Amino acid sequence: MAKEFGIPAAVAGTVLNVVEAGGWVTTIVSILTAVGSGGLSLLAAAGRESIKAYLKKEIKKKGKRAVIAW
Protein backbone atom coordinates (compact mmCIF):
# COMPACT_ATOMS: atom_id res chain seq x y z
CA MET A 1 0.00 0.00 0.00
CA ALA A 2 2.88 2.34 0.76
CA LYS A 3 5.02 1.59 -2.24
CA GLU A 4 2.40 1.26 -4.94
CA PHE A 5 -0.20 3.75 -3.67
CA GLY A 6 1.69 6.11 -1.39
CA ILE A 7 -0.65 5.32 1.50
CA PRO A 8 1.11 5.92 4.86
CA ALA A 9 1.66 3.00 7.24
CA ALA A 10 -0.65 4.36 9.95
CA VAL A 11 -3.58 4.68 7.56
CA ALA A 12 -2.80 1.40 5.79
CA GLY A 13 -2.60 -0.54 9.04
CA THR A 14 -5.89 0.93 10.24
CA VAL A 15 -7.59 -0.09 7.04
CA LEU A 16 -6.28 -3.66 7.15
CA ASN A 17 -7.18 -4.01 10.84
CA VAL A 18 -10.75 -2.97 9.96
CA VAL A 19 -10.71 -5.58 7.18
CA GLU A 20 -9.44 -8.30 9.56
CA ALA A 21 -11.97 -7.34 12.24
CA GLY A 22 -14.80 -7.73 9.77
CA GLY A 23 -15.57 -4.02 9.69
CA TRP A 24 -17.85 -2.31 7.16
CA VAL A 25 -17.07 -1.53 3.52
CA THR A 26 -18.31 1.99 4.27
CA THR A 27 -15.61 2.47 6.87
CA ILE A 28 -12.87 1.31 4.52
CA VAL A 29 -14.15 3.48 1.67
CA SER A 30 -14.35 6.55 3.90
CA ILE A 31 -10.78 6.15 5.10
CA LEU A 32 -9.37 5.53 1.63
CA THR A 33 -11.23 8.43 0.00
CA ALA A 34 -10.17 10.70 2.84
CA VAL A 35 -6.47 9.87 2.38
CA GLY A 36 -6.78 11.15 -1.18
CA SER A 37 -5.18 10.15 -4.48
CA GLY A 38 -3.48 7.07 -3.08
CA GLY A 39 -6.71 5.78 -1.56
CA LEU A 40 -8.62 6.59 -4.72
CA SER A 41 -6.03 4.65 -6.71
CA LEU A 42 -6.38 1.61 -4.43
CA LEU A 43 -10.17 1.77 -4.73
CA ALA A 44 -9.70 1.91 -8.55
CA ALA A 45 -7.38 -1.08 -8.46
CA ALA A 46 -10.11 -3.18 -6.87
CA GLY A 47 -12.19 -2.82 -10.01
CA ARG A 48 -15.75 -3.95 -9.40
CA GLU A 49 -14.77 -6.20 -6.50
CA SER A 50 -15.73 -5.12 -2.99
CA ILE A 51 -12.73 -3.26 -1.56
CA LYS A 52 -13.12 -5.45 1.54
CA ALA A 53 -12.91 -8.68 -0.45
CA TYR A 54 -10.02 -7.37 -2.55
CA LEU A 55 -7.93 -6.48 0.50
CA LYS A 56 -8.88 -9.74 2.22
CA LYS A 57 -7.51 -11.63 -0.78
CA GLU A 58 -4.36 -9.49 -0.82
CA ILE A 59 -3.76 -10.41 2.81
CA LYS A 60 -4.27 -14.10 2.06
CA LYS A 61 -1.82 -13.84 -0.87
CA LYS A 62 0.93 -11.72 0.65
CA GLY A 63 0.42 -11.61 4.42
CA LYS A 64 -0.76 -8.48 6.23
CA ARG A 65 2.68 -7.01 6.73
CA ALA A 66 3.48 -7.18 3.02
CA VAL A 67 0.10 -5.69 2.12
CA ILE A 68 0.91 -2.68 4.27
CA ALA A 69 4.26 -2.33 2.47
CA TRP A 70 2.54 -2.70 -0.91
Side-chain angles (χ1 to χ4, degrees):
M1 290 169 69
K3 189 151 167 313
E4 295 289 64
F5 305 95
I7 301 170
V11 173
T14 298
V15 170
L16 301 186
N17 279 337
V18 168
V19 168
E20 279 184 346
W24 295 336
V25 162
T26 51
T27 298
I28 295 161
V29 167
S30 292
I31 297 170
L32 295 176
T33 49
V35 86
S37 62
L40 294 179
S41 293
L42 179 56
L43 296 164
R48 270 219 208 165
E49 181 177 23
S50 158
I51 179 61
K52 175 168 181 179
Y54 175 76
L55 293 175
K56 258 179 180 164
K57 192 177 198 166
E58 290 281 336
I59 289 169
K60 184 164 66 184
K61 284 196 292 158
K62 307 185 168 180
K64 185 212 251 187
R65 181 183 180 162
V67 176
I68 289 174
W70 172 79

